[PDB]
Design a protein around this nucleic acid. Structure first.
Ligand SMILES: [Mg+2]
Ligand SMILES: [Mg+2]
Ligand SMILES: [Mg+2]
Ligand SMILES: [Mg+2]
Ligand SMILES: [Mg+2]
Ligand SMILES: [Mg+2]
Ligand SMILES: [Mg+2]
Ligand SMILES: [Mg+2]
Ligand SMILES: [Mg+2]
Ligand SMILES: [Mg+2]
Ligand SMILES: [Mg+2]
Ligand SMILES: [Mg+2]
Ligand SMILES: [Mg+2]
Ligand SMILES: [Mg+2]
Ligand SMILES: [Mg+2]
Ligand SMILES: [Mg+2]
Ligand SMILES: [Mg+2]
Ligand SMILES: [Mg+2]
Ligand SMILES: [Mg+2]
Ligand SMILES: [Mg+2]
Ligand SMILES: [Mg+2]
Ligand SMILES: [Mg+2]
Ligand SMILES: [Mg+2]
Ligand SMILES: [Mg+2]
Ligand SMILES: [Mg+2]
Ligand SMILES: [Mg+2]
Ligand SMILES: [Mg+2]
Ligand SMILES: [Mg+2]
Ligand SMILES: [Mg+2]
Ligand SMILES: [Mg+2]
Ligand SMILES: [Mg+2]
Ligand SMILES: [Mg+2]
Ligand SMILES: [Mg+2]
Ligand SMILES: [Mg+2]
Ligand SMILES: [Mg+2]
Ligand SMILES: [Mg+2]
Ligand SMILES: [Mg+2]
Ligand SMILES: [Mg+2]
Ligand SMILES: [Mg+2]
Ligand SMILES: [Mg+2]
Ligand SMILES: [Mg+2]
Ligand SMILES: [Mg+2]
Ligand SMILES: [Mg+2]
Ligand SMILES: [Mg+2]
Ligand SMILES: [Mg+2]
Ligand SMILES: [Mg+2]
Ligand SMILES: [Mg+2]
Ligand SMILES: [Mg+2]
Ligand SMILES: [Mg+2]
Ligand SMILES: [Mg+2]
Ligand SMILES: [Mg+2]
Ligand SMILES: [Mg+2]
Ligand SMILES: [Mg+2]
Ligand SMILES: [Mg+2]
Ligand SMILES: [Mg+2]
Ligand SMILES: [Mg+2]
Ligand SMILES: [Mg+2]
Ligand SMILES: [Mg+2]
Ligand SMILES: [Mg+2]
Ligand SMILES: [Mg+2]
Ligand SMILES: [Mg+2]
Ligand SMILES: [Mg+2]
Ligand SMILES: [Mg+2]
Ligand SMILES: [Mg+2]
Ligand SMILES: [Mg+2]
Ligand SMILES: [Mg+2]
Ligand SMILES: [Mg+2]
Ligand SMILES: [Mg+2]
Ligand SMILES: [Mg+2]
Ligand SMILES: [Mg+2]
Ligand SMILES: [Mg+2]
Ligand SMILES: [Mg+2]
Ligand SMILES: [Mg+2]
Ligand SMILES: [Mg+2]
Ligand SMILES: [Mg+2]
Ligand SMILES: [Mg+2]
Ligand SMILES: [Mg+2]
Ligand SMILES: [Mg+2]
Ligand SMILES: [Mg+2]
Ligand SMILES: [Mg+2]
Ligand SMILES: [Mg+2]
Ligand SMILES: [Mg+2]
Ligand SMILES: [Mg+2]
Ligand SMILES: [Mg+2]
Ligand SMILES: [Mg+2]
Ligand SMILES: [Mg+2]
Ligand SMILES: [Mg+2]
Ligand SMILES: [Mg+2]
Ligand SMILES: [Mg+2]
Ligand SMILES: [Mg+2]
Ligand SMILES: [Mg+2]
Ligand SMILES: [Mg+2]
Ligand SMILES: [Mg+2]
Ligand SMILES: [Mg+2]
Ligand SMILES: [Mg+2]
Ligand SMILES: [Mg+2]
Ligand SMILES: [Mg+2]
Ligand SMILES: [Mg+2]
Ligand SMILES: [Mg+2]
Ligand SMILES: [Mg+2]
Ligand SMILES: [Mg+2]
Ligand SMILES: [Mg+2]
Ligand SMILES: [Mg+2]
Ligand SMILES: [Mg+2]
Ligand SMILES: [Mg+2]
Ligand SMILES: [Mg+2]
Ligand SMILES: [Mg+2]
Ligand SMILES: [Mg+2]
Ligand SMILES: [Mg+2]
Ligand SMILES: [Mg+2]
Ligand SMILES: [Mg+2]
Ligand SMILES: [Mg+2]
Ligand SMILES: [Mg+2]
Ligand SMILES: [Mg+2]
Ligand SMILES: [Mg+2]
Ligand SMILES: [Mg+2]
Ligand SMILES: [Mg+2]
Ligand SMILES: [Mg+2]
Ligand SMILES: [Mg+2]
Ligand SMILES: [Mg+2]
Ligand SMILES: [Mg+2]
Ligand SMILES: [Mg+2]
Ligand SMILES: [Mg+2]
Ligand SMILES: [Mg+2]
Ligand SMILES: [Mg+2]
Ligand SMILES: [Mg+2]
Ligand SMILES: [Mg+2]
Ligand SMILES: [Mg+2]
Ligand SMILES: [Mg+2]
Ligand SMILES: [Mg+2]
Ligand SMILES: [Mg+2]
Ligand SMILES: [Mg+2]
Ligand SMILES: [Mg+2]
Ligand SMILES: [Mg+2]
Ligand SMILES: [Mg+2]
Ligand SMILES: [Mg+2]
Ligand SMILES: [Mg+2]
Ligand SMILES: [Mg+2]
Ligand SMILES: [Mg+2]
Ligand SMILES: [Mg+2]
Ligand SMILES: [Mg+2]
Ligand SMILES: [Mg+2]
Ligand SMILES: [Mg+2]
Ligand SMILES: [Mg+2]
Ligand SMILES: [Mg+2]
Ligand SMILES: [Mg+2]
Ligand SMILES: [Mg+2]
Ligand SMILES: [Mg+2]
Ligand SMILES: [Mg+2]
Ligand SMILES: [Mg+2]
Ligand SMILES: [Mg+2]
Ligand SMILES: [Mg+2]
Ligand SMILES: [Mg+2]
Ligand SMILES: [Mg+2]
Ligand SMILES: [Mg+2]
Ligand SMILES: [Mg+2]
Ligand SMILES: [Mg+2]
Ligand SMILES: [Mg+2]
Ligand SMILES: [Mg+2]
Ligand SMILES: [Mg+2]
Ligand SMILES: [Mg+2]
Ligand SMILES: [Mg+2]
Ligand SMILES: [Mg+2]
Ligand SMILES: [Mg+2]
Ligand SMILES: [Mg+2]
Ligand SMILES: [Mg+2]
Ligand SMILES: [Mg+2]
Ligand SMILES: [Mg+2]
Ligand SMILES: [Mg+2]
Ligand SMILES: [Mg+2]
Ligand SMILES: [Zn+2]
Lengths: 151, 112, 101, 140, 59, 116
RNA sequence: CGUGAGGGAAAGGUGAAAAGAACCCCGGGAGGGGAGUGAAAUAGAGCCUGAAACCGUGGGCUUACAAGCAGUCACGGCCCCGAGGGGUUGUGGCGUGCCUAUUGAAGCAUGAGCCGGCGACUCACGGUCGUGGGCGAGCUUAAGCCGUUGAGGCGGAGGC
RNA sequence: GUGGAGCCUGGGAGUGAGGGCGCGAGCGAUAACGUCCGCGUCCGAGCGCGGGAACAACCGAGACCGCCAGCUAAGGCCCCC
RNA sequence: GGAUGACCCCAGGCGGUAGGGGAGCGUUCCCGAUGCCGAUGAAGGCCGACCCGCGAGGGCGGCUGGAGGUAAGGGAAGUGC
């Protein structure tokens, strides 16, 4: 703290309480005891857990019928209305949130702005996103990498 | 019907003026005027101004009649104090509070 | 005619038409119960020794409730011992129907 | 059922001939009468005892050597101010004080007990001025 | 001396009971018999300058 | 993140202050004095609901005793006679009888003399 | 503030918009009362909210024969809201503040005028036990690298 | 003898100023609200409750809460009570 | 008893300082949330003799306030004078 280290008034005979410097945490303006300092919250969760975790999450959507694999995306060539059309046709009215996983950049751009859609490349598939969303939609090429990652 | 006047931030200490204010609570406007007139306190100059101002308001804004007016309520509230240093022996500095009053007078009409 | 009846480890002087709160009875609201009689007085006087064989007081249970809360607080100086408990005693409300003498 | 509380009652006046009675053994009874504890509706926080008239207080009796040895005491607040007056002398000067003092000590301290004591009316000699009250004579 | 000092703060009840004798008594006033204006008895009237039935003073 | 006192302490103090309504001077006005006053108050209440049970029974007894002596016996005799007769009317009730119902009380007195 | 090196504060908020109150009235002025503005003016510039201590006016109940850690239990009176409750408190019963420190405190032992706000068991890294999971003769990666731009993966050196 | 008994492995303590009383001794003066040991107790932590006028350790007794019910304990029962 | 912490029934324990252990309440912040409550009135303040809870507390109503607040379930601490 910015104050000096001078003892503010003598130890004895002033009729006041003893103090040292006004930086001491007992003074308004003084330092703080045990406040937060810069911190690293990370830690290395076991790799197998992440793996087993990934797999279970996809498994969970699978068991609900909410996981849908697709071959390709019709006419979606980077326009929202294009993805929107395709989606309607694919059974995604947007009443249910969707984690769309595909390596097709053109498809991610088309869908990203939709409030009910989270997009990801397959290298990015992770359990928070699967668990946050109601429906899982994947490229086969996407489904392929995920199968290699849970191997 | 009521008419009121408030003198705010009068530089006199509440306890001193209340003493004068207490002399006129409930009195007829006329009696209160006499009393203040021959009350030997500084407070009387100030209470007299709030009275006369309330009386004016009664007659001029509120359609009440001077001859029927009486001090229906009056009170003194404390304003913010002026803090001043009073130097004492041995380096000590005391603090004098030069206190402040808000004086309220409220007149009513004593009907019939 | 009055009766001195005993319910809930306690005794009451009841007359027909009386509403009375007693300790909680295990009987549905609207039911009717027979209280024991220890003494009958009024026109004739009959004195239980301790209860009177034939008599009973008939009560309809109007309902069951909880008493207004009493705070039970405990404090011991110089020992930082403090306890605060809220207490509501359960009771039954009875209407006294008749004194079967 | 809550315990009965009496509404205000008309107090009963009573008359007692103190002659030849034993001071202390009379005083306890006067006390009971003043508290009102002969009454089945006794209530401890109201004056609802009898008014008590006593006559012939000067003819109260006392056992042992107490006329000579019983000493009444008064403190004035001043240095050396403890006066000691013996029974004999108190009887010879303010005889009614003897009973008065004994009954007073047998009443509760507090506002009520003080009030109860005012209901006691003690006279030396056979007569009293409470005729208007037509006090009922009591043997005790 | 050894610097006496209050042992306890005075309660509002006590402070104000000390002040049970502090009320001002209003000025005693009698009418001026000449101009009817209210004034202190035994003073020359400051409204009209009259005292003992005569003009004493320019007002 | 920081969690400053905020609203929390004013709210505990009002709770206590509100329980202290009625108390003298700072005892209803100062959180500190109120809290002291309340510690005492809760212990008395506890103690006193215990002794109310005693306070009343002592009263019933003074009353029963008065009513007995009108019929020429004392409380102690009357209670023994009741016991022997097998009468279990309690003192709360014996007392109400003694005042509201003199004829009934008389009969219980009778059974009591008779029972010995 | 200190000769000086040096110490070192407090102090934020009208309103959507100044529409920041023309004019009249009392007053030397300050201040107020009307008028006016505004959804709102106890938002009027000493301006959002506006707690508490503290000071006051008005009202209900109460108090001048009374003995007190200030309450509590009981009853009764009065006042209020409408077989009930609330306020108040006459009488009766009971009753030795809080905290600290002590063998032991109401203690004539410490601390505290009151109120509001600030105010003291944490974090890193290692260890030891317990515990929730993952894998199990095996378990695990570090620094880094790739990716992302709140996405994860790779990396077996090394450690147990 | 099934008890907030016991034994084993481990985690967390706190305590290491005691004090009164009864009995047994020493020290002291067959002194101390003295001191120092032993066995027991209570206070400590039961300054919660009844009795002892009042009163940590004497007598009675181990307070989970409520009751305007009953029986007792020590101590009491002439009035205060 | 029923099968499983659903609730009923019988019995027993439940004074406590140092101290061990358990279960909870509330404060700030994050996910929940591109959501939901909100000018037909956010937070905050002042009342309440009402409801729930052993309690810490939480509701509900009236007044003030005038623009924010934030659930079920979880997470993290500058968390309670
Ligand atoms: Mg510095
Ligand atoms: Mg520095
Ligand atoms: Mg500096
Ligand atoms: Mg330094
Ligand atoms: Mg320095
Ligand atoms: Mg230095
Ligand atoms: Mg010193
Ligand atoms: Mg000092
Ligand atoms: Mg100081
Ligand atoms: Mg100081
Ligand atoms: Mg110092
Ligand atoms: Mg310091
Ligand atoms: Mg220093
Ligand atoms: Mg410093
Ligand atoms: Mg700082
Ligand atoms: Mg700073
Ligand atoms: Mg600090
Ligand atoms: Mg620190
Ligand atoms: Mg520090
Ligand atoms: Mg830290
Ligand atoms: Mg860092
Ligand atoms: Mg950590
Ligand atoms: Mg790390
Ligand atoms: Mg989106
Ligand atoms: Mg979403
Ligand atoms: Mg004068
Ligand atoms: Mg005029
Ligand atoms: Mg000088
Ligand atoms: Mg000062
Ligand atoms: Mg000053
Ligand atoms: Mg019950
Ligand atoms: Mg009951
Ligand atoms: Mg204490
Ligand atoms: Mg104590
Ligand atoms: Mg303590
Ligand atoms: Mg202690
Ligand atoms: Mg304590
Ligand atoms: Mg008699
Ligand atoms: Mg009594
Ligand atoms: Mg004489
Ligand atoms: Mg006494
Ligand atoms: Mg000297
Ligand atoms: Mg001097
Ligand atoms: Mg000198
Ligand atoms: Mg001096
Ligand atoms: Mg002093
Ligand atoms: Mg004061
Ligand atoms: Mg006052
Ligand atoms: Mg005084
Ligand atoms: Mg004249
Ligand atoms: Mg913040
Ligand atoms: Mg804080
Ligand atoms: Mg704060
Ligand atoms: Mg607060
Ligand atoms: Mg608090
Ligand atoms: Mg608050
Ligand atoms: Mg609170
Ligand atoms: Mg009161
Ligand atoms: Mg007060
Ligand atoms: Mg006060
Ligand atoms: Mg106050
Ligand atoms: Mg409390
Ligand atoms: Mg109790
Ligand atoms: Mg008790
Ligand atoms: Mg007899
Ligand atoms: Mg018996
Ligand atoms: Mg019996
Ligand atoms: Mg210098
Ligand atoms: Mg300079
Ligand atoms: Mg310096
Ligand atoms: Mg500063
Ligand atoms: Mg602004
Ligand atoms: Mg602005
Ligand atoms: Mg606006
Ligand atoms: Mg002018
Ligand atoms: Mg002006
Ligand atoms: Mg004006
Ligand atoms: Mg104006
Ligand atoms: Mg308008
Ligand atoms: Mg509006
Ligand atoms: Mg307002
Ligand atoms: Mg405003
Ligand atoms: Mg201000
Ligand atoms: Mg604003
Ligand atoms: Mg404001
Ligand atoms: Mg203000
Ligand atoms: Mg205020
Ligand atoms: Mg008043
Ligand atoms: Mg007297
Ligand atoms: Mg009187
Ligand atoms: Mg009392
Ligand atoms: Mg009573
Ligand atoms: Mg009432
Ligand atoms: Mg009452
Ligand atoms: Mg005691
Ligand atoms: Mg005391
Ligand atoms: Mg004591
Ligand atoms: Mg405390
Ligand atoms: Mg301390
Ligand atoms: Mg010490
Ligand atoms: Mg010491
Ligand atoms: Mg010592
Ligand atoms: Mg003391
Ligand atoms: Mg003292
Ligand atoms: Mg000292
Ligand atoms: Mg002290
Ligand atoms: Mg010391
Ligand atoms: Mg100071
Ligand atoms: Mg204060
Ligand atoms: Mg504070
Ligand atoms: Mg720690
Ligand atoms: Mg560890
Ligand atoms: Mg582990
Ligand atoms: Mg694993
Ligand atoms: Mg190693
Ligand atoms: Mg076992
Ligand atoms: Mg054990
Ligand atoms: Mg054990
Ligand atoms: Mg531990
Ligand atoms: Mg240790
Ligand atoms: Mg230790
Ligand atoms: Mg040692
Ligand atoms: Mg040692
Ligand atoms: Mg020692
Ligand atoms: Mg020992
Ligand atoms: Mg020893
Ligand atoms: Mg002793
Ligand atoms: Mg020994
Ligand atoms: Mg012996
Ligand atoms: Mg020995
Ligand atoms: Mg030896
Ligand atoms: Mg000798
Ligand atoms: Mg010793
Ligand atoms: Mg000895
Ligand atoms: Mg010895
Ligand atoms: Mg021992
Ligand atoms: Mg200790
Ligand atoms: Mg004991
Ligand atoms: Mg023990
Ligand atoms: Mg205790
Ligand atoms: Mg004792
Ligand atoms: Mg005792
Ligand atoms: Mg005693
Ligand atoms: Mg004891
Ligand atoms: Mg027990
Ligand atoms: Mg018995
Ligand atoms: Mg015995
Ligand atoms: Mg005795
Ligand atoms: Mg006495
Ligand atoms: Mg316990
Ligand atoms: Mg446990
Ligand atoms: Mg725990
Ligand atoms: Mg909760
Ligand atoms: Mg909190
Ligand atoms: Mg929590
Ligand atoms: Mg944040
Ligand atoms: Mg968001
Ligand atoms: Mg939001
Ligand atoms: Mg809406
Ligand atoms: Mg609107
Ligand atoms: Mg509203
Ligand atoms: Mg909030
Ligand atoms: Mg907030
Ligand atoms: Mg609340
Ligand atoms: Mg609000
Ligand atoms: Mg906003
Ligand atoms: Mg939230
Ligand atoms: Mg939450
Ligand atoms: Mg979560
Ligand atoms: Mg802190
Ligand atoms: Zn004249």
């Amino acid at each position: 703290v910015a104050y000096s280290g001078r003892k503010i008034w003598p130890q004895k005979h002033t009729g006041r309480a003893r103090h040292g410097d006004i930086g001491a945490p007992i003074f308004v303006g003084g330092g703080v005891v045990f406040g937060p300092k810069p911190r690293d919250y990370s830690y290395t969760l076991p790799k197998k857990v992440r793996k087993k975790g990934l797999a279970m999450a996809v498994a969970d959507r699978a068991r609900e019928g909410k996981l849908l694999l697709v071959e390709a995306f019709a006419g979606v060539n980077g326009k929202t209305k294009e993805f929107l059309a395709w989606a309607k046709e694919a059974g995604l009215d947007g009443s249910e949130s969707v984690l769309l996983v595909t390596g097709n950049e053109l498809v991610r751009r088309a869908a990203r702005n939709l409030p009910w859609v989270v997009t990801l490349a397959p290298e990015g598939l992770n359990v928070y996103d699967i668990v946050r969303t109601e429906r899982l939609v994947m490229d086969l090429d996407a489904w392929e990498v995920f199968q290699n990652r849970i191997g | 019907m009521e008419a009121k006047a408030i003198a705010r931030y009068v530089r006199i200490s509440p306890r001193k003026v209340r003493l004068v204010v207490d002399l006129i609570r409930g009195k007829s406007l006329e009696e209160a005027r006499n009393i203040l007139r021959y009350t030997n306190k500084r407070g009387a100059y100030f209470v007299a101004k709030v009275l006369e101002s309330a009386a004016a308001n009664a007659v001029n804004n509120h359609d009440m009649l001077e001859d029927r007016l009486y001090v229906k309520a009056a009170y003194v509230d404390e304003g913010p104090a002026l803090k001043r240093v009073l130097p004492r022996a041995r380096g000590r500095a005391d603090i004098i509070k030069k206190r402040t009053s808000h004086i309220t007078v409220i007149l009513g009409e004593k009907h019939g | 005619m009055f009766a001195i009846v005993k319910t809930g480890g306690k005794q009451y002087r009841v007359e027909p038409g009386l509403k009375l709160r007693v300790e909680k009875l295990d009987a549905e609201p609207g039911a009717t119960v027979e209280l024991p009689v220890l003494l009958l007085g009024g026109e004739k006087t009959v004195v239980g020794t301790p209860v009177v064989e034939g008599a009973s007081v008939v009560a309809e249970v109007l309902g069951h409730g909880r008493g207004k809360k009493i705070l039970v607080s405990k404090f011991k100086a110089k020992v930082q011992y403090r306890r605060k408990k809220g207490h509501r005693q359960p009771y039954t409300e009875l209407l006294i129907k008749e004194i079967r003498g | 059922m809550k315990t009965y509380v009496p509404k205000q009652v008309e107090p009963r006046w009573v008359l007692i001939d103190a002659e030849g009675k034993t001071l202390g053994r009379l005083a306890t009874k006067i006390a009971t009468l003043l508290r009102g504890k002969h009454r089945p509706d006794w209530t401890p926080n109201v004056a609802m005892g009898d008014f008590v008239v006593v006559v012939n207080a000067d003819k109260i009796r006392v056992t042992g050597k107490k006329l000579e040895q019983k000493i009444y005491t008064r403190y004035s607040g001043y240095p050396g101010g403890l006066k000691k007056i013996p029974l004999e002398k108190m009887l010879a000067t303010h005889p009614e004080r003897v009973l008065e003092h004994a009954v007073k000590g047998m009443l509760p301290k507090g506002p009520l007990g003080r009030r109860l004591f005012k209901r006691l009316k003690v006279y030396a000699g056979p007569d009293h001025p409470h005729q208007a009250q037509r006090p009922e004579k009591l043997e005790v | 001396a050894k610097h006496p000092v209050p042992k306890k703060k005075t309660s509002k009840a006590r402070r104000d009971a000390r002040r049970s004798h502090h009320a001002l008594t209003p000025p005693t006033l009698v009418p001026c018999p000449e101009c009817k204006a209210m004034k202190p008895p035994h003073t020359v009237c400051p409204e009209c300058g009259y005292y003992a039935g005569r003009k004493v003073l320019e007002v | 993140p920081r969690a400053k006192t905020g609203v929390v302490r004013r709210r505990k103090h009002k709770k206590i202050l509100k329980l202290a309504k009625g108390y003298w001077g700072l005892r209803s006005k100062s959180f500190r004095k109120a809290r002291e006053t309340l510690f005492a108050a809760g212990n008395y209440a506890y103690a006193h609901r215990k002794r109310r049970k005693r306070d009343f029974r002592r009263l019933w007894i003074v009353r029963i005793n008065a009513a007995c002596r009108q019929h020429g016996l004392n409380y102690s005799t009357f209670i023994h006679g009741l016991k022997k007769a097998g009468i279990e009317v309690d003192r709360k009730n014996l007392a109400d009888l003694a005042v509201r119902e003199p004829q009934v009380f008389a009969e219980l007195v009778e059974r009591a003399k008779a029972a010995q």
